[PDB]
């Protein structure tokens, strides 16, 4: 059963949570190939592990930049959580380490690129296409939430497509293990629940709201709340009104009304029956949840492949150096990393 699987998953997780792996490789064991993404919150690089020739995605954070952004605790969260999890639609840490300058997290490489890239190019996904991805998110959240983890940054930019067309939920920079309410203003404007915008204490229900935004954007091709500036976006989100495209099915509209629900007592995922309100909704009627988890379902789209370590599904970013100071930076701040 589901409850049995999750019980065992939690036991596996907690052992790694209470005794995190630390300093399990070194930069010089990897060959840097290409920058896969970059921004103020660090970068992800394709690297080759020398001893095996395996390819990995390596997230690199500059410790000093982390400190300036006040993301020390959040970064320790990300590493501590990712080294402890194990799930078909997550990329756990294979290795992690740090040097004088940077923090490194090495995980499975997904060569199909960001969902964001394909969604924008293709324009929108068909409902069955959207549903295939949504299913994997539903299961991943069921997993994370059962471990008391809140994810807090669902978006196409943080969803990677693997060689078989399945998804990896990446970017755990705002992920937190919390049993009660929490208060941090974080996320991405288009995906923020009303609770967050209005500076209330919130819980894992914000992830289920975020799922509503994702499913909408996947099926529509644009988000349900968009504008040129974040402030105009927040006004729309709190307003309590959403418009659906005429091509949206009845079932899709109804699922979304129940996900994009300002009222926490009625928002799907949050209620007495939990995730089963979502799993048992008419829109997911054709969804074989075990087949999704088992990866037996045929993906409606598979990315173009041309070999191992191919990067054609990713954009091109300017390659910056990986600089390592001769002096140790922020040692005490990141001692547990």
């Amino acid at each position: 059963s589901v409850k049995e699987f999750l019980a065992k998953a939690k036991e596996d997780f907690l052992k790694k949570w209470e005794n995190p792996a630390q300093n399990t490789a070194h930069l010089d064991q990897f060959e840097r190939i290409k920058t896969l993404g970059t921004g103020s919150f660090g970068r992800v690089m394709l690297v080759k592990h020398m001893e095996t020739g395996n390819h990995y995605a390596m997230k690199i954070l500059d410790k000093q930049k982390v400190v300036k952004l006040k993301q020390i605790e959040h970064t320790l969260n990300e590493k501590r959580i990712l080294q402890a999890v194990n799930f078909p639609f997550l990329t756990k840490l294979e290795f992690s380490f740090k040097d004088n300058s940077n923090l490194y997290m090495v995980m499975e490489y997904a060569p199909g690129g960001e969902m964001f890239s394909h969604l924008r190019r293709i324009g929108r996904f068909s409902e069955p296409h959207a549903r295939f991805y949504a299913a994997q998110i539903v299961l991943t959240f069921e997993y994370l939430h059962s471990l008391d983890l809140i994810y807090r940054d669902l978006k196409p930019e943080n969803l990677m497509i693997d060689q078989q067309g399945y998804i990896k939920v990446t970017d755990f920079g705002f992920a937190k293990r919390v049993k009660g309410r929490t208060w941090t203003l974080c996320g991405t404007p288009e995906y923020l629940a009303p609770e967050i915008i209005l500076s209330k204490g919130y819980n894992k229900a914000v992830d289920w709201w975020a799922l509503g935004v994702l499913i909408y954007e996947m099926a529509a091709g644009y988000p349900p709340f968009f504008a040129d500036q974040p402030i105009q976006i927040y006004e729309k989100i709190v307003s309590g009104k959403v418009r659906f495209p005429s091509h949206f099915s009845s079932d899709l509209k109804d699922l979304l009304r129940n996900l994009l629900q300002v009222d926490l007592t009625k928002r799907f995922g949050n209620l007495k029956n939990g995730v089963n309100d979502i799993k048992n909704h008419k829109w997911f009627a054709t969804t074989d949840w075990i087949a999704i988890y088992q990866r037996k379902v045929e993906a409606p789209f598979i990315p173009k492949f041309k070999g191992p370590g191919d990067t054609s599904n990713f954009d091109d970013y300017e390659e910056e150096e990986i600089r390592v100071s001769i002096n140790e930076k922020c040692g005490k701040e990141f001692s547990e990393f």
Partner: peptide, 20 residues
């Protein structure tokens, strides 16, 4: 159209996280 309005907007690229 809503699509036209989205595509003409300044937020069709990769969206950054926010924070305090």
């Amino acid at each position: 159209t809503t699509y036209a309005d989205f595509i003409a907007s300044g937020r069709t690229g990769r969206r950054n996280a926010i924070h305090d």
